[PDB]
Design a protein around this ligand. Structure first.
Ligand SMILES: Nc1nc2c(ncn2[C@@H]2O[C@H](COP(=O)(O)OP(=O)(O)OP(=O)(O)O)[C@@H](O)[C@H]2O)c(=O)[nH]1
Lengths: 469, 111, 109, 84, 97, 86, 35, 95
């Protein structure tokens, strides 16, 4: 009997570690004759050598095609006893057996293994002759090496029977399965596949047919990568909720001409357009900049997306619209989080879309901005972020200051185009859902030219904030 | 069978071709750097000796070079030989761009 | 055929005792610096006149300056058969001075 | 007749004998023999070892405690010890 | 005259170093057995005591070894690294930057 | 070859794993002591600001301090790597 | 083999002290020391 | 080709400093000559290594005899190998 899981292409036997075949020996009558071997009398073919005990030694009985099926005879623990021409082996499972030194047909020994072994072949095997494949490997360990293996070697010399040395691992050890677990000393891919299909089905039952089969396994061996598109334009966006401090960070980035990119085109805003932008007009704006500056293909752009436009429709337009894809593509996506602006209200509550801009597929890097904050609170937050987002590259900036190594890592690294994230972002469609509205009512601007005493600004920030609830 | 002025011309060809740029903007883009100085020294000497081996002259050379970061410290460079009056000789040269104070010192000996 | 040969440790010693006893922790006065080099260079040359090397040819060179939080590289390259011709060198720095002398050698033939 | 000692349990003492006797037969010049023993013992245990082979030689070395093995292997003599 | 020694790398004014050398030599004699923990502890607790050594960005670190390699963001004023020739201990002293 | 192992440590779990990854990469890439220390020091100066110190070797002892949650001493294949901040 | 001869020469370099922007020590410097 | 030196046959070009070499070259035949003979074994190499550790750097190894051979790592440029009258001598330093 057996119990298993069967998904679509393959199956998993839950209980395989229990061996299919095992046996014990319930007849003592013959073993008792060997067990009681009185000392003073001798029998010639054994000899007379004395060895107290040779514990902790292993015996392997080789099995052929049946082992590959999963039917194999297990490795026995055993001890040895030595005589001038024979070997009395005590197997815990099978009793006391006799090995004469005339049965071996061929011989090999190996120094590769961690312990020294001795392989040979015998015509009649100890176990059931029907299943076995009549080759036997005896390990020697500890004192046995000095006491037994070497005496047997001397015997081989005197008879001039051929003894060979095998440098590589023996084939039979590679053939079997228990051999693999004793020479060494998959499922997680199974778990990753199941959770992947769960998330893909969560996106849409109709559209959950990306691979949905053994082609998914071809993504497991998709480690080697290569991609580069010429005669196009590499954009390096910067997300971030409102009052995250993204504009000046982008300006701090553009000043890095030292690397091998060397020439890069700012993207410059001002607040008065900024009120009236929309997702559609954005695209026209970039095209206008490209025409205006006669930009060559090598150079790149540093554009800072405001909070109100939602990147999902933007990527939709990058893939959909002809002209944009004809002359533009996305290098990398950076983000921003501010510890001081983490919560929307004095009661704990999050501002809109703080922990949804960092999703693993869509945003490569996640940055923290801290000013005059106690270290312990920052570390506690670090733990919370790592919990919320399963996998993300989190760094730490203090007041928009850039380590030059970080600048190089940002600027030169293009990985968004890589197909791996292309399937990852589809796996995470449900989580990265952002809802925001742009309009005259949502955001507005008011020109104003007059001087203002500050106390009433405090009247505002006190009254409106405290009574805002 | 030589002229030391030609030696100096070869050295100047080497140094100018290697780093020296006609338009004076990148040599400020190339200031003294702690990281890059090793590559510069070895590259200068190697290219200079390549130029020196382009000469088929049977004479026997040797080289030395010095790179000072700033003018503030000051320095003294001096030669003194024990050699032949007729054919043997030495050579020196001083060199400056914006923040790099380079010097070369060569010895030419017969055989 | 080179019975008597140039060895580095001998000149290494020689420059070692010359430098310390002559310099004696002096400061870098501009008016005299160039000419300081002029005295001790010829003094050096006098010492190697009794350096016990007949055909090895002696292209002396010296550096002398003051260290002020200052980075400097000095290096050289050779063109000579290793079996006979060889070189030697020494450096010496106090709290605000550095003097370093290199001596060449080329077996005449 | 002489067997200077090393660590207990025959982790190392047992290994060296077994390896040395492949080594002695498989080559003729000492070079490959000493190289082979040293090259194995660097991979298995430690970062820097020292080995000597010969019929006759005098020696006297510094080393790390319980890492000095000396044994007369057949007509030859083999010396081994860690250092560094 | 100082006890003999080799300066692989020093950056403080010599007098600070002189004090370090004298105390270190007498201490190494004073504690000729045991572990180098105790050498670091005693050296710091002396060195931390004097009204000299006033200026410190971070605070004191002392490392001892016979085989290692390191990279350190030391304060630009004070750092030392040298060896005591009878015993050949590589001893490293600085202030955290 | 073998995985790392902390003989003494003070970090959070997610931060233990990052130093694991970077130590493996460093040993795979460079082959010298000061190079290893210099690389790891740069990596954690990139990820957490300024003020990391790292000592790598086979023979050394130490009296130091650090920020409370930023110290580790771990061994990889008989190499003692010590790392701390401030 | 009598081969006496002698020479001399001197290099040197320009002098100029600016001392307007002068005197920076990058305080949190880093170095790499080994044994 | 084991070039001749005023001590004995030394393999060249030398892979040891000249002062260290000269020290070894003169000390071996001095120490043999004065109050030492070929019948004694270890107590030679004893004295040789002591002499090297006194003046030069501390950690040395010495191997000599009439037949042996080794591969070994050593400090840079600190290998002495020479024959004298059909007797092989080898010495090297490790940190
Ligand atoms: N003065 C001050 N600065 C802070 C404080 N907290 C964070 N910062 C810094 O100030 C920036 C905050 O940005 P904002 O004040 O919202 O203005 P901004 O930089 O233009 O941000 P955007 O409106 O998104 O462009 C952060 O990037 C930090 O670098 C604080 O409490 N006081």
């Amino acid at each position: 009997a057996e119990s298993f899981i069967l998904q679509e292409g393959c199956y998993l036997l839950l209980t395989k570690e229990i061996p299919y075949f095992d046996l014990w020996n319930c007849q003592n009558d013959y073993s008792e004759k060997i067990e009681k071997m009185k000392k003073r009398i001798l029998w010639e073919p054994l000899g007379k050598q004395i060895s107290d005990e040779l514990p902790k030694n292993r015996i392997f009985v080789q099995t052929g095609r049946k082992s590959n099926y999963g039917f194999d005879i297990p490795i026995m623990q055993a001890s040895y006893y030595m005589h001038e021409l024979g070997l009395r082996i005590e197997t815990q499972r099978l009793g006391w057996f006799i090995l004469f030194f005339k049965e071996m047909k061929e011989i090999q020994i190996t120094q590769k293994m961690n312990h020294t072994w001795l392989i040979f072949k015998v015509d009649s095997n100890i176990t059931f002759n029907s299943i076995s494949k009549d080759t036997i490997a005896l390990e020697f360990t500890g004192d046995a090496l000095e006491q037994s293996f070497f005496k047997i070697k001397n015997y081989f010399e005197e008879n001039q029977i051929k003894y060979e040395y095998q440098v590589d691992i023996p084939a039979i050890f590679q053939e079997s399965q228990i051999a693999k677990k004793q020479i060494l000393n998959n499922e997680q891919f199974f778990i990753s596949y199941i959770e992947s299909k769960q998330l893909m089905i969560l996106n849409q039952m109709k559209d959950l047919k990306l691979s949905a089969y053994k082609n998914l396994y071809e993504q497991m061996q998709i480690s080697q990568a290569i991609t580069p598109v010429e005669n196009h334009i590499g954009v390096i966006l910067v997300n971030g909720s409102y009052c995250s401090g993204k504009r000046k960070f982008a300006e701090n980035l553009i000043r890095f001409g030292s690397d091998n990119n060397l020439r890069l085109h700012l993207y410059k805003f001002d607040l008065n357009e900024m009120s009236e932008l929309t997702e559609k007009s954005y695209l026209s704006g970039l095209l206008k900049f490209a025409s205006e500056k006669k930009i060559q293909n090598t150079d790149v752009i540093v554009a800072s997306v405001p909070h109100f436009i939602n990147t999902k429709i933007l990527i939709d337009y990058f893939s959909k619209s002809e002209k944009i894809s004809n002359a533009f593509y996305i290098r990398t996506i950076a983000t921003k989080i501010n510890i001081n602006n983490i919560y929307s209200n004095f009661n704990k509550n999050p501002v809109n879309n703080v922990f949804t801009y960092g999703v693993e597929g869509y945003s490569q890097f996640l940055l923290l901005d801290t000013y005059n904050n106690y270290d312990a609170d920052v570390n506690a937050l670090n733990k919370t972020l790592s919990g919320v987002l399963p996998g993300a590259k989190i760094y730490k900036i203090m007041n928009n200051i850039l380590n030059p190594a970080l600048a190089k890592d940002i600027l030169t690294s293009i990985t968004f185009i890589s197909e791996q994230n292309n399937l990852n972002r589809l796996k995470y469609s449900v989580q990265y859902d952002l809802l925001t509205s742009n309009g005259p009512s949502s955001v507005v601007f008011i020109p104003f030219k007059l001087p203002i005493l500050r106390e009433k600004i405090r009247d505002l920030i006190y009254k409106k904030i405290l009574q805002n609830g | 069978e030589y002229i030391s002025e030609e030696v100096q011309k070869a050295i100047d060809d080497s140094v100018k071709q290697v780093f020296g740029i006609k338009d004076d903007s990148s040599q400020v883009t190339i200031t003294y750097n702690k990281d890059k100085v090793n590559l510069w020294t070895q590259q200068i000497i190697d290219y200079t000796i390549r130029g020196l081996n382009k000469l088929g002259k049977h004479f026997k050379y040797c080289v030395t070079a010095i790179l000072q970061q700033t003018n503030h410290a000051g320095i003294s460079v001096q030669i003194t030989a024990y050699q032949d009056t007729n054919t043997d000789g030495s050579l020196i040269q001083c060199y400056e761009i914006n923040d790099i104070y380079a010097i070369v010192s060569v010895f030419a000996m017969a055989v | 055929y080179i019975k008597n040969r140039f060895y580095p440790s001998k000149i290494q010693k020689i420059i070692k005792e010359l430098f310390e006893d002559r310099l004696k922790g002096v400061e870098y006065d501009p008016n005299n610096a160039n000419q300081l080099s002029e005295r001790l260079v010829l003094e050096l040359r006098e010492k190697i006149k009794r350096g016990k090397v007949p055909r090895y040819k002696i292209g002396v060179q010296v550096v002398f300056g003051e260290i002020k939080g200052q980075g400097l590289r000095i290096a050289s390259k050779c063109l000579w058969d290793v079996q006979n011709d060889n070189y030697a060198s020494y450096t010496y720095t106090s709290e605000k001075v550095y003097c370093t002398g290199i001596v060449f050698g080329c077996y005449f033939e | 007749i002489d067997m200077p000692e090393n660590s207990e349990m025959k982790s190392m003492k047992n290994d060296a004998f077994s390896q040395a006797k492949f080594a002695v037969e498989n080559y003729k010049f000492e070079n490959k023999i000493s190289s082979h023993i040293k090259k194995f013992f660097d991979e298995k245990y430690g970062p820097n070892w020292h080995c000597v082979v010969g019929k006759h030689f005098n020696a006297y070395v510094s080393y790390d405690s319980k890492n000095f093995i000396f044994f007369y292997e057949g007509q030859l003599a083999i010396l081994l010890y860690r250092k560094g | 005259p100082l006890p003999p020694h080799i300066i692989r790398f020093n950056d403080m004014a010599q007098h600070l170093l002189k004090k370090v050398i004298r105390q270190a030599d007498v201490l190494i004699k004073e504690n000729p057995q045991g572990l180098e923990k105790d050498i670091a502890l005693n050296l710091v607790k002396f060195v931390k005591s004097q009204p000299e050594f006033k200026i410190g960005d971070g605070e004191w670190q002392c490392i001892i070894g016979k085989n290692f390699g390191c990279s350190l963001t030391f304060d630009a004023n004070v750092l030392a690294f040298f060896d005591l020739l009878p015993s050949r201990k590589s001893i490293l002293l600085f202030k955290s930057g | 070859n073998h995985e790392p192992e902390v003989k003494a440590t003070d970090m959070e779990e997610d931060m233990i794993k990052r130093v694991k990854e970077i130590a493996i990469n460093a040993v795979k890439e460079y082959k010298q002591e000061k190079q290893i220390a210099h690389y790891i020091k740069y990596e954690f100066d990139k990820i957490d600001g300024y003020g990391w110190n790292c000592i790598v070797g086979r023979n050394f002892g130490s009296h130091i301090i650090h920020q409370t949650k930023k110290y580790i001493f771990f061994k990889i294949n008989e190499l003692c790597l010590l790392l701390w901040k401030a | 083999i009598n081969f006496q001869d002698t020479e001399t020469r001197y290099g040197g370099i320009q002098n100029q002290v600016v001392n307007i922007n002068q005197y920076v020590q990058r305080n949190p410097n880093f170095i790499d020391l080994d044994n | 080709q084991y070039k001749t030196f005023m001590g004995a046959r030394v393999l060249w070009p030398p892979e040891c400093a000249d002062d260290i070499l000269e020290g070894a070259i003169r000390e071996t035949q001095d120490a043999l000559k004065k109050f030492e003979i070929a019948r004694e074994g270890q107590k030679i190499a004893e004295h040789l290594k002591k002499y090297m550790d006194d003046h030069f750097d501390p950690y040395w190894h010495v191997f000599f005899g009439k037949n042996f051979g080794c591969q070994a790592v050593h400090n840079k440029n600190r290998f002495i190998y020479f024959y004298i009258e059909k007797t092989a001598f080898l010495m090297y330093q490790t940190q």
